[PDB]
Amino acid sequence: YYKGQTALHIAIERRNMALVTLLVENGADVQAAAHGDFFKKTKGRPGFYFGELPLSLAACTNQLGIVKFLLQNSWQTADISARDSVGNTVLHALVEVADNTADNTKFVTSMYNEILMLGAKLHPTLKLEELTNKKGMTPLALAAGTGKIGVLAYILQREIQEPECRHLSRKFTEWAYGPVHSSLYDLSCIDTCEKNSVLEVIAYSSSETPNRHDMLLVEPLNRLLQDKWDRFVKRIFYFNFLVYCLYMIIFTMAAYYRPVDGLPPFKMEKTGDYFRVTGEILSVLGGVYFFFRGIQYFLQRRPSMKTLFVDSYSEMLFFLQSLFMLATVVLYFSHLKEYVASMVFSLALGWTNMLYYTRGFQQMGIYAVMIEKMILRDLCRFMFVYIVFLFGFSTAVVTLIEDSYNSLYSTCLELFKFTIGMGDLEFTENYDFKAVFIILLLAYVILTYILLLNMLIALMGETVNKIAQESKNIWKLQRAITILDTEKSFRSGKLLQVGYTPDGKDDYRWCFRVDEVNWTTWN
Amino acid sequence: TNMLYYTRGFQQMGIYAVMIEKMILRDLCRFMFVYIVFLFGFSTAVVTLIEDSYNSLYSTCLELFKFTIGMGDLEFTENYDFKAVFIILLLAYVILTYILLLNMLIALMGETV
Amino acid sequence: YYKGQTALHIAIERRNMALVTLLVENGADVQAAAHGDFFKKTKGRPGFYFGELPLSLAACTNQLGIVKFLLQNSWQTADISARDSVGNTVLHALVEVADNTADNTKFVTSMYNEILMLGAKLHPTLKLEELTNKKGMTPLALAAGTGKIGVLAYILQREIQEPECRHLSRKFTEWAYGPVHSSLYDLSCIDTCEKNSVLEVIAYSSSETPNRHD
Ligand SMILES: CCCCCCCCCCCCCCCCCC(=O)OC[C@H](COP(=O)(O)O[C@@H]1[C@H](O)[C@H](O)[C@@H](O)[C@H](O)[C@H]1O)OC(=O)CCCCCCCCCCCCCCCCC
Ligand SMILES: CCCCCCCC/C=C/CCCCCCCC(=O)O[C@@H](COC(=O)CCCCCCCCCCCCCCC)COP(=O)([O-])OCC[N+](C)(C)C
Ligand SMILES: CCCCCCCC/C=C/CCCCCCCC(=O)O[C@@H](COC(=O)CCCCCCCCCCCCCCC)COP(=O)([O-])OCC[N+](C)(C)C
Ligand SMILES: CCCCCCCC/C=C\CCCCCCCC(=O)O[C@@H](COC(=O)CCCCCCCCCCCCCCC)COP(=O)([O-])OCC[N+](C)(C)C
Ligand SMILES: CCCCCCCC/C=C\CCCCCCCC(=O)O[C@@H](COC(=O)CCCCCCCCCCCCCCC)COP(=O)([O-])OCC[N+](C)(C)C
Ligand SMILES: CCCCCCCC/C=C\CCCCCCCC(=O)O[C@@H](COC(=O)CCCCCCCCCCCCCCC)COP(=O)([O-])OCC[N+](C)(C)C
Ligand SMILES: CCCCCCCC/C=C\CCCCCCCC(=O)O[C@@H](COC(=O)CCCCCCCCCCCCCCC)COP(=O)([O-])OCC[N+](C)(C)C
Ligand SMILES: CCCCCCCC/C=C\CCCCCCCC(=O)O[C@@H](COC(=O)CCCCCCCCCCCCCCC)COP(=O)([O-])OCC[N+](C)(C)C
Ligand SMILES: CCCCCCCC/C=C\CCCCCCCC(=O)O[C@@H](COC(=O)CCCCCCCCCCCCCCC)COP(=O)([O-])OCC[N+](C)(C)C
Ligand SMILES: CCCCCCCC/C=C\CCCCCCCC(=O)O[C@@H](COC(=O)CCCCCCCCCCCCCCC)COP(=O)([O-])OCC[N+](C)(C)C
Ligand SMILES: CCCCCCCC/C=C\CCCCCCCC(=O)O[C@@H](COC(=O)CCCCCCCCCCCCCCC)COP(=O)([O-])OCC[N+](C)(C)C
Ligand SMILES: CCCCCCCC/C=C\CCCCCCCC(=O)O[C@@H](COC(=O)CCCCCCCCCCCCCCC)COP(=O)([O-])OCC[N+](C)(C)C
């Protein structure tokens, strides 16, 4: 629990820089391995993780005066990389500790700056940040995966104004003509990475992973995806939308002009049945595509059990459409007319799934997201209570009905008509007590139609006030996944020379030119 | 309808005519795209299921425009083969268009104002 | 791209008022014609437009101490009208540079005031603002067409309290009886103009033309 904890960790955590000097002189190392349960991540534990090592403790402790000592001393030669039981360095661990609190953000980014410079002052034989833990995650990708927008904003916009420590900048200003100043944001492992690009870790994040939808508003990401969109994804996406529209046009007439005379599999006799069979072939193949394209989404991401049903909603409804399609093949060869039952569900899913492709458009794509955030937030709450009432008063009505509205379906059906403006208050005279029948419908009308539908409109109006910004930020991620999937299924930015590493060479960098214009920054 | 031009000589009415513009384009265009996707989506799905004169894409698209104006019969055909399909598919239509998307329009149309 | 750019434009843009003094003494004119693609409007170009002329550069640069020098010197006699490849003067160009940012609004209107007075101190044989570019647009109509509400608010409400420079005011207070004070806003080329009244350029503006409705 307190395993590995030396007296030097006491000298640090108690904010006593004097004894940390003395304790290492006695032999007690500064590479001490606090592999204790208290000293690992919480995961249901009241503990604190800092990096398993003294240097990592002081960095995560509001202790800068100490951290410089753990390196600059003659007694011990504490390695600055110095991984732990999980591979995390001081820089990794210094991302594990961030909480997105503003007071924590200002602190971690200040400290995170200082160890980098110190890691360059002593020996440049590094690339600190290109080290990975035992999840194969750099601190950059670790702040993106763990949802640490504050650190991510720093690492991307990192500019250090001094000669030796500018190679570790990743925001280079190239030219300026007064108010105009032009940056050269580095793209190394934001879009092109071997392991865990920033974009492949924001967009493809698990649903919790906080601030999934804010991590892209971090400049240059909103601006780089819009470059990929305007350049080589707007053309492909609108071609994906074409083929899907044509596919739906083709699966629709092959469904509209289906046979009605016999059993399946029907047989080709006339010319017009050769045009539909292709319409049926070209229909099913897309259902193999959206099937395999859906299986891949559950084998090249392998999202958890929860992450089938909390954030993958579109990918489900194209896969689900494919299941109703590949149930429509099994039952068109099983000699069964229930393929139609599956086939109309495929159409209904299919056309509704145009509401996917309207994410290539801002005001329409935000609209498609509000629809999501109403189906789940306002319509689920509604349709639970509405079914309680509907089935509540239905039973109460069909109970009262005797001796064919003496049925629970038609009563639940006739009471669904009050809500669509088609309720007869006289759909039965087959009862024994009229005040009961009508007090019980007026109770239904008042509670469901007058109150609860109109209440839905109110809920549904309080939601729009809230998700106006969130749904734009959910829209840009949906377009991001569209950009990234297009890439995996064109290199952005040019290979500019920005400066020089502190060993003599040209620091070649793939960089994204941005052009801002201020009027108080005359320098 | 072009009287709604000349009501710009009046403040509270002329502002009203401008809100009408900024709803036709902002809220009703977004609505009537998605509404036609659903309408034509579920219509095809219904007239597919219909056999042997509601075996038509017009009248089905027409009868499904009646759920939104409060005139939708959930029994405008018995000419089908599967009733759960016909009614799950209309309730899907009603819930998505009438209960959700019209009432959502009112919400959008209220955030605009 | 950098065409026409002299070493004097360097001495200005680098905010060095000392070398601008020396460089004109060597013959390098202060009517220099920076007809370069970088020095024209963006229209899909990462450039900066200032007015194609040094006097126009410093006016659009957070440089007032320099602008008075480009006129008040014995070595060269920089014309204050001094049109460019598109006809814009310092006053026109000083509207092209406005962005409606509040920090830019306070700046351009302060500077836009100063060249007018200086344009009156040296020689009144002008009507600076009644000069037009090659679109037939004065700086007034150019701030209305280009959507520059901050400059437009200045030019219309322009009142300068001093004897010689009040003819360039266009907001004259006539009478006052304590709390009551009565203005006389000038209407010359707001409603009655030969070319491009302010109202005929706000209302009849293209749809982008920002702040049409403000
Ligand atoms: C026999 C089987 C019986 C059935 C049960 C089996 C399980 C059901 C399937 C599981 C799924 C259930 C879905 C329930 C309905 C709601 C769906 C909906 O709001 O999804 C919006 C979605 C948005 O994008 P995405 O999801 O990509 O974005 C996500 C998302 O934003 C996330 O928050 C962010 O992390 C991030 O942005 C990104 O990760 O976009 C679309 O889904 C495309 C548009 C599709 C239309 C959306 C409208 C709703 C249609 C529902 C009804 C279908 C049509 C009628 C069918 C009739 C009967 C057959
Ligand atoms: C997907 C979500 C639901 C959408 C649908 C929404 C609609 C409402 C929900 C409908 C769902 C339930 C449908 C009925 C289930 C089978 C029994 C049945 O049909 O009737 C039984 C009758 O007696 C009853 O129905 C009362 C017993 C309760 C059954 C339902 C469980 C309660 C939860 C669910 C209820 C919701 C409560 C609120 C929920 C929080 C048996 O009789 P019968 O089969 O009719 O046989 C003919 C009898 N005859 C010979 C006399 C003619
Ligand atoms: C102004 C905006 C629209 C307003 C109207 C809104 C209403 C909905 C929109 C209606 C617009 C389309 C109307 C149909 C076009 C002609 C084909 C036709 O009539 O039916 C064809 C059938 O098969 C089909 O209709 C399926 C093929 C798709 C056709 C439409 C293209 C998809 C986009 C548009 C669709 C929207 C999708 C969502 C949009 C994002 C051919 O058959 P028929 O001609 O009937 O011939 C009689 C056949 N009989 C002998 C068997 C009896
Ligand atoms: C094709 C979509 C293009 C999209 C753009 C246009 C926008 C869409 C807008 C408007 C729609 C306009 C067309 C409406 C149809 C009327 C004409 C017609 O087909 O009549 C025939 C019906 O046809 C069928 O039964 C064929 C059904 C499947 C067709 C799908 C294409 C086939 C695959 C290849 C496609 C090419 C792939 C390349 C695509 C680039 C008449 O025959 P029938 O006597 O009714 O007999 C039918 C069977 N029955 C016995 C059951 C009755
Ligand atoms: C080989 C037959 C040739 C003839 C076919 C005739 C065409 C008839 C149509 C459709 C019939 C074609 C077969 C079914 C396709 C299923 C739909 C599909 O895949 O959609 C995908 C297209 O992405 C593709 O890669 C599609 C395949 C390439 C297009 C080739 C045909 C287009 C020809 C015509 C070209 C235009 C010129 C015509 C006039 C305008 C959609 O993109 P996605 O990335 O999958 O995103 C959705 C999935 N997600 C939500 C889970 C992310
Ligand atoms: C077979 C034929 C299939 C149809 C052709 C399809 C292929 C060609 C498709 C698309 C090419 C481009 C279409 C025009 C877009 C205009 C832009 C616009 O107004 O955008 C605005 C609204 O969004 C819309 O207006 C889009 C409306 C829905 C999609 C286009 C209608 C046609 C498809 C319907 C019929 C489907 C059913 C089948 C029909 C038969 C949003 O603004 P923005 O523009 O995003 O502004 C930039 C903001 N941003 C940079 C932050 C993002
Ligand atoms: C037989 C017996 C049947 C019983 C009755 C059957 C009723 C069936 C229906 C609804 C059942 C009741 C569900 C109540 C949910 C409460 C709202 C909620 O949590 O909203 C959250 C949605 O995010 C989610 O993850 C919840 C999604 C709920 C189900 C989604 C499927 C709906 C598909 C379509 C089907 C709909 C039409 C149904 C057609 C019939 C958002 O909430 P929030 O404001 O953000 O706060 C929570 C924050 N949080 C997200 C971080 C947690
Ligand atoms: C919100 C808190 C939850 C409350 C839930 C409990 C509430 C329950 C309340 C009341 C319970 C009892 C009501 C029914 C009477 C008993 C049955 C009976 O014999 O009926 C008979 C007595 O004849 C009548 O006319 C009906 C009696 C008057 C009912 C109206 C007053 C109550 C309405 C206020 C309702 C509550 C308001 C609440 C406001 C907050 C019916 O006969 P008829 O119809 O005259 O003749 C048949 C006609 N025929 C021949 C044409 C066929
Ligand atoms: C959040 C809580 C939710 C609510 C929970 C609690 C429930 C709240 C809900 C409903 C409760 C309130 C309504 C009570 C209904 C009584 C029914 C009754 O008795 O019918 C009997 C009327 O009997 C008569 O004697 C009629 C003459 C009296 C006039 C009644 C007023 C009209 C009622 C209308 C109400 C509609 C408006 C409702 C607007 C509110 C039937 O007998 P009859 O033979 O038909 O009539 C006599 C002969 N005659 C026709 C010649 C006259
Ligand atoms: C053939 C006969 C044709 C009719 C005669 C037409 C000619 C005579 C027409 C108009 C003369 C004046 C009418 C009264 C105006 C009252 C002012 C008022 O209340 O204004 C308010 C509401 O706006 C309205 O009340 C206006 C309502 C619509 C127009 C007038 C109704 C008659 C035309 C309908 C029938 C058409 C169909 C044909 C009918 C046969 C607004 O406030 P304000 O007043 O603006 O306040 C000042 C604010 N401001 C300074 C910022 C702006
Ligand atoms: C939102 C995400 C998208 C989901 C889309 C996919 C959803 C698709 C769901 C389901 C797909 C399958 C449904 C139909 C059954 C197959 C066809 C068949 O044989 O039907 C028969 C089986 O008899 C029945 O009674 C129907 C079976 C029960 C259906 C109700 C449960 C599902 C409702 C929940 C719906 C989803 C809730 C979603 C909540 C989130 C019909 O026979 P009948 O009617 O009994 O007899 C005929 C009557 N007659 C003789 C008078 C003529
Ligand atoms: C965002 C996502 C959007 C949604 C997407 C997913 C879709 C969501 C939408 C709809 C899905 C939920 C509804 C399922 C409908 C089933 C239809 C069916 O099976 O019909 C069969 C009923 O078969 C029976 O067995 C009836 C007895 C069971 C009671 C059923 C409850 C009432 C359903 C009412 C529902 C209305 C209320 C709906 C309120 C929600 C028909 O057979 P029958 O011969 O007529 O009946 C048997 C004999 N009897 C009459 C003597 C009893």
Residue numbers in the entry:
A (entry chain A): 199 to 601, 627 to 712, 721 to 754
B (entry chain B): 550 to 601, 627 to 687
C (entry chain B): 199 to 412
The paper states:
Thus, a founding member of the vanilloid subfamily of TRP channels, TRPV1, represents one of the most sought-after pain therapy targets. Here we report the cryo-electron microscopy structures of human TRPV1 in the apo state and in complex with the TRPV1-specific nanomolar-affinity analgesic antagonist SB-366791. It includes a transmembrane domain (TMD) with the central ion channel pore and an intracellular skirt that is mostly built of ankyrin repeat domains (ARDs) connected by the three-stranded β-sheets and C-terminal hooks. The TMD is composed of six transmembrane helices S1–S6 and a re-entrant pore loop (P-loop) between S5 and S6.
We purified full-length hTRPV1 in lipid nanodiscs using soybean mix and synthetic lipids (POPC:POPE:POPG, 3:1:1) and subjected these two protein samples to cryo-EM. The corresponding 3D reconstructions showed C4 symmetry and yielded nearly identical structures, with a slightly better resolution for the sample purified in synthetic lipids (2.58 Å) compared to the soybean lipid mix (2.90 Å). At the same time, the model of hTRPV1 in synthetic lipids only included the residues 199–754. In addition, while both structures had residues 602–626 unresolved, the structure in synthetic lipids was also missing density for residues 713–720 and the corresponding region was not included into the model. We used both structures for our analysis, but for illustrations related to the transmembrane region, we mostly used the structure obtained in synthetic lipids. The apo-state structure of hTRPV1 shows multiple well-resolved densities of annular lipids in the TMD. Most of these densities have a clear head-and-two-tails appearance and were modeled with phosphatidylcholine (PC). An exception is the vanilloid binding site where a bulky head density justified its best fit with phosphatidylinositol (PI), consistent with the previously solved apo-state structures of rat and squirrel TRPV115,17,19,32–34. Accordingly, the head of PI is accommodated by polar and charged residues of the linker domain (H411), the S2-S3 loop (D509 and S512), the S4-S5 linker (R557 and E570) and the TRP helix (Q701), while the PI tails face hydrophobic residues of S3 and S4 from one subunit, and S5 and S6 from the neighboring subunit. The pore of hTRPV1 in the apo and SB-366791-bound structures has two narrow constrictions, one in the selectivity filter formed by the backbone carbonyl oxygen of G644 and another one in the gate region of S6 bundle crossing formed by the side chains of I680.
